[PDB]
Design an enzyme around this catalytic site. Structure first.
Site, PDB file in Angstrom:
ATOM      1  CG  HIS A  63      38.424  40.923  37.745  1.00 33.52           C
ATOM      2  ND1 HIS A  63      37.446  42.091  37.803  1.00 33.52           N
ATOM      3  CD2 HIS A  63      39.135  41.300  39.014  1.00 33.52           C
ATOM      4  CE1 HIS A  63      37.487  42.784  38.721  1.00 33.52           C
ATOM      5  NE2 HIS A  63      38.668  42.420  39.576  1.00 33.52           N
ATOM      6  CG  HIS A  93      44.708  35.943  32.860  1.00 36.59           C
ATOM      7  ND1 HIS A  93      45.851  36.317  33.348  1.00 36.59           N
ATOM      8  CD2 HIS A  93      44.391  36.915  32.044  1.00 36.59           C
ATOM      9  CE1 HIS A  93      46.070  37.559  32.582  1.00 36.59           C
ATOM     10  NE2 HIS A  93      45.309  37.965  31.800  1.00 36.59           N
ATOM     11  CG  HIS A  95      41.296  38.824  28.676  1.00 38.41           C
ATOM     12  ND1 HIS A  95      41.003  39.787  29.729  1.00 38.41           N
ATOM     13  CD2 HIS A  95      42.787  38.480  28.716  1.00 38.41           C
ATOM     14  CE1 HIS A  95      42.269  40.028  30.515  1.00 38.41           C
ATOM     15  NE2 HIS A  95      43.239  39.342  29.874  1.00 38.41           N
ATOM     16  CD  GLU A 105      42.425  42.031  27.352  1.00 37.89           C
ATOM     17  OE1 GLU A 105      43.455  41.827  27.898  1.00 37.89           O
ATOM     18  OE2 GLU A 105      41.348  42.738  27.966  1.00 37.89           O
ATOM     19  CG  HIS A 118      46.766  37.848  28.424  1.00 36.91           C
ATOM     20  ND1 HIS A 118      45.926  38.815  28.591  1.00 36.91           N
ATOM     21  CD2 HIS A 118      47.033  37.821  26.977  1.00 36.91           C
ATOM     22  CE1 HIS A 118      45.672  39.455  27.686  1.00 36.91           C
ATOM     23  NE2 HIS A 118      46.159  39.015  26.507  1.00 36.91           N
ATOM     24  CB  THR A 197      44.689  44.321  29.388  1.00 31.31           C
ATOM     25  OG1 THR A 197      44.523  43.215  29.893  1.00 31.31           O
ATOM     26  CG2 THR A 197      45.789  44.280  28.148  1.00 31.31           C
TER      27      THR A 197
HETATM   28  N1  LIG Z   1      45.583  40.863  31.253  1.00 29.98           N
HETATM   29  S1  LIG Z   1      47.171  41.123  31.531  1.00 29.98           S
HETATM   30  O1  LIG Z   1      47.925  42.395  31.176  1.00 29.98           O
HETATM   31  O2  LIG Z   1      47.872  39.956  31.278  1.00 29.98           O
HETATM   32  C1  LIG Z   1      47.472  41.246  33.447  1.00 29.98           C
HETATM   33  C2  LIG Z   1      48.485  40.489  34.077  1.00 29.98           C
HETATM   34  C3  LIG Z   1      48.488  40.538  35.348  1.00 29.98           C
HETATM   35  C4  LIG Z   1      47.686  41.505  35.895  1.00 29.98           C
HETATM   36  N2  LIG Z   1      47.654  41.632  37.446  1.00 29.98           N
HETATM   37  C5  LIG Z   1      48.188  40.824  38.460  1.00 29.98           C
HETATM   38  O3  LIG Z   1      48.736  39.819  38.373  1.00 29.98           O
HETATM   39  C6  LIG Z   1      47.814  41.650  39.667  1.00 29.98           C
HETATM   40  N3  LIG Z   1      48.370  41.280  41.075  1.00 29.98           N
HETATM   41  C7  LIG Z   1      49.317  42.169  41.626  1.00 29.98           C
HETATM   42  O4  LIG Z   1      49.659  43.237  41.349  1.00 29.98           O
HETATM   43  N4  LIG Z   1      49.969  41.253  42.648  1.00 29.98           N
HETATM   44  C8  LIG Z   1      49.416  39.679  42.280  1.00 29.98           C
HETATM   45  C9  LIG Z   1      49.102  39.174  43.638  1.00 29.98           C
HETATM   46  C10 LIG Z   1      50.499  39.128  44.312  1.00 29.98           C
HETATM   47  C11 LIG Z   1      51.324  38.878  43.058  1.00 29.98           C
HETATM   48  C12 LIG Z   1      50.550  38.861  41.943  1.00 29.98           C
HETATM   49  C13 LIG Z   1      48.598  39.883  41.498  1.00 29.98           C
HETATM   50  O5  LIG Z   1      47.773  39.036  40.905  1.00 29.98           O
HETATM   51  C14 LIG Z   1      46.663  42.407  35.521  1.00 29.98           C
HETATM   52  C15 LIG Z   1      46.630  42.083  34.007  1.00 29.98           C
HETATM   53 ZN   LIG Z   2      45.244  39.456  30.395  1.00 27.09          ZN
END
Ligand SMILES: NS(=O)(=O)c1ccc(NC(=O)CN2C(=O)NC3(CCCC3)C2=O)cc1
Ligand SMILES: [Zn+2]
Ligand SMILES: NS(=O)(=O)c1ccc(NC(=O)CN2C(=O)NC3(CCCC3)C2=O)cc1
Length: 259
Positions: A63, A93, A95, A105, A118, A197
């Site tokens: 992603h 990370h 986008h 975003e 982010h 997001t």
């Molecule tokens: N674009 S955003 O809103 O910043 C944004 C930020 C984070 C996430 N998602 C995550 O971090 C998803 N995720 C979990 O739920 N568990 C882990 C693996 C173990 C701990 C962390 C993981 O990677 C999705 C969107």
């Molecule tokens: Zn993000």
């Protein structure tokens, strides 16, 4: 299993079927109307404390790519501003778009930036990231816009490792990276309550979006656009346009840190 993505057939307009919170009351991102956002004198000073940040690894997760940190202790934390307590950096990370005219975003008066950084932090009162995402104040994400102009020297170490993580599921060592090289000069920001997001779109995020974009070079963002959504040995799908569009603001106010 998770089959969501950013294509016509699995993109943001489909996510609600497996993640009904996609149509919820505090979804992200949003458009930031700069004229409607109000200065909030109740906001405390923002504190970005990354001196002891310990990067470990960079991962193409199909992603985006995540630069992951050691979050086993309070090494890199975000505090102050709208936040109560201590939020630990776990990963950052981006986008980005297929073209310089889209990729962010969040939008600013409907303006789309070329990309958005982010920096993801979790509230240490909940003990672990998995518990934090189940709480309305579980995460704080620091969002930084990228525009195309002069190179960002602090980004180049990230750009130069992307050749080694082209495809989904590839990772590489990424130690001793200082994320302070990715910030702009000003910490002026907007803040509002929102969500992840990407699926699972959990409504657990305090968003802090810096007003001042960073500049990156065309050459730097072109290297982001050579990554792949696909795995090794699969048909090439360039990792571009991995952004969710602005969602309804609903019953929310965006607050400004600056007068
Ligand atoms: N674009 S955003 O809103 O910043 C944004 C930020 C984070 C996430 N998602 C995550 O971090 C998803 N995720 C979990 O739920 N568990 C882990 C693996 C173990 C701990 C962390 C993981 O990677 C999705 C969107
Ligand atoms: Zn993000
Ligand atoms: N509501 S949702 O989560 O966005 C959502 C949207 C679409 C789908 N199902 C799809 O059509 C997508 N899907 C396939 O059919 N085949 C693959 C390609 C090869 C691996 C699996 C794929 O990606 C599932 C969930």
């Amino acid at each position: 299993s998770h089959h969501w993505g950013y294509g016509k057939h699995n993109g943001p307009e489909h996510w609600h079927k497996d993640f009904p919170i996609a149509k919820g009351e505090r979804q992200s991102p949003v458009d930031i109307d700069t004229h409607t956002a109000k200065y909030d004198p109740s906001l405390k000073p923002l504190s970005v404390s990354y001196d002891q940040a310990t990067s470990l690894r960079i991962l193409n997760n199909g992603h985006a790519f995540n630069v992951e940190f050691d979050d086993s202790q309070d090494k890199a934390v975000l505090k102050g501003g709208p936040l109560d307590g201590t939020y630990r950096l776990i990963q950052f990370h981006f986008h980005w778009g297929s073209l310089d005219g889209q990729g962010s975003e969040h939008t600013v008066d409907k303006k789309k930036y070329a990309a958005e950084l982010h920096l993801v932090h979790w509230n240490t009162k909940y003990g672990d990231f998995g518990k934090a995402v189940q709480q309305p104040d579980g995460l704080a994400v620091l969002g930084i816009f990228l525009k195309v102009g002069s190179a960002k020297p602090g980004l180049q170490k990230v750009v130069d490792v992307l050749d080694s993580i082209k495809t989904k599921g590839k990772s590489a060592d990424f130690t001793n990276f200082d994320p302070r090289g990715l910030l702009p000069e000003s910490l002026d920001y907007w803040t509002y309550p929102g969500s992840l997001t990407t699926p699972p779109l959990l409504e657990c995020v305090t968003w802090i979006v810096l007003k001042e974009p960073i500049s990156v070079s065309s050459e730097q963002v072109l290297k982001f656009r050579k990554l792949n959504f696909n795995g090794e040995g699969e048909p090439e799908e360039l990792m571009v346009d991995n952004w969710r569009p602005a969602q309804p603001l609903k019953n929310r106010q965006i607050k400004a840190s600056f007068k």
